Amino acid sequence: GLLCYCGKGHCKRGERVRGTCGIRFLYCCPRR
């Protein structure tokens, strides 16, 4: 989608990582 959210373990294709925001959670901002 087009909304940032904390990815578990790692973000998936389409999402851009922007740091971390939780235990084993990283900031993911998808553009699709």
UniProtKB/Swiss-Prot annotation:
Disulfide bonds join 4-29, 6-21, 11-28. It is found in: Secreted; Cytoplasmic vesicle, Secretory vesicle. Paneth cells of the small bowel. Belongs to the alpha-defensin family. Host-defense peptide that has antimicrobial activity. Exhibits activity against Gram-negative E.coli (in vitro). Probably contributes to the antimicrobial barrier function of the small bowel mucosa. This is Defensin alpha 4. The lineage of its organism: Eukaryota, Metazoa, Chordata, Craniata, Vertebrata. The gene is Defa4. The chain holds residues 61 to 92 of 92 of the full protein.
